[PDB]
Amino acid sequence: AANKLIKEMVQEDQKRMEKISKRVNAIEEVNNNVKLLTEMVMSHSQGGAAAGSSEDLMKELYQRCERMRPTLFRLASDTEDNDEALAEILQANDNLTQVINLYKQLVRGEEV
């Protein structure tokens, strides 16, 4: 109902929750995309292939990966007093930079 000044509290609870949940969804999405793109890139590393639709899916996964870095940068500037959350973010960005590295190699003839 109509209330006095304890609206700062339910609104704080709300920001706590949104913050954590956005982190979770980001990290999960990262973990998922990195793992599959990795799996796929390796398999096309002169072994089992598909081309066509597979080229399409690796491309999409690659673009999603590029798109998540900005997202992680923005999440990391919102981790006031939680170095643990900040660390998870930073490890996830590392997973992303890395995978965006294999894809690129795969796409332009390199090894590894």
Swiss-Prot record:
Belongs to the GGA protein family. The lineage of its organism: Eukaryota, Metazoa, Chordata, Craniata, Vertebrata. Changing residue 48 to S: In a breast cancer sample; somatic mutation. Monomer. Interacts with GGA2 and GGA3. Binds to clathrin and activated ARFs, including ARF1, ARF5 and ARF6. Interacts with RABEP1. Interacts with RABGEF1. Interacts with the type-I membrane proteins LRP3, M6PR/CD-MPR and IGF2R/CI-MPR. Interacts (via N-terminal VHS domain) with SORL1/sorLA and SORT1 (via C-terminal cytosolic domain). Interacts with EPN4. Interacts with CCDC91. Interacts with HEATR5B/p200a. Interacts with SYNRG/gamma-synergin. Interacts (via GAE doamin) with NECAP1 and NECAP2. Interacts (via GAE domain) with AFTPH/aftiphilin. Interacts with TSG101 and UBC. Interacts with RNF11. The chain holds residues 192 to 303 of 639 of the full protein. Phosphorylated by CK2 and dephosphorylated by PP2A. Phosphorylation of GGA1 allows the internal DXXLL motif to bind the VHS domain and to inhibit the recognition of cargo signals. Ubiquitinated. The VHS domain functions as a recognition module for sorting signals composed of an acidic cluster followed by two leucines (DXXLL motif). Residues 1-108 form the GAT domain. Ubiquitously expressed. Plays a role in protein sorting and trafficking between the trans-Golgi network (TGN) and endosomes. Mediates the ARF-dependent recruitment of clathrin to the TGN and binds ubiquitinated proteins and membrane cargo molecules with a cytosolic acidic cluster-dileucine (DXXLL) motif. Mediates export of the GPCR receptor ADRA2B to the cell surface. Required for targeting PKD1:PKD2 complex from the trans-Golgi network to the cilium membrane. Regulates retrograde transport of proteins such as phosphorylated form of BACE1 from endosomes to the trans-Golgi network. It comes from Homo sapiens (Human). This is ADP-ribosylation factor-binding protein GGA1.
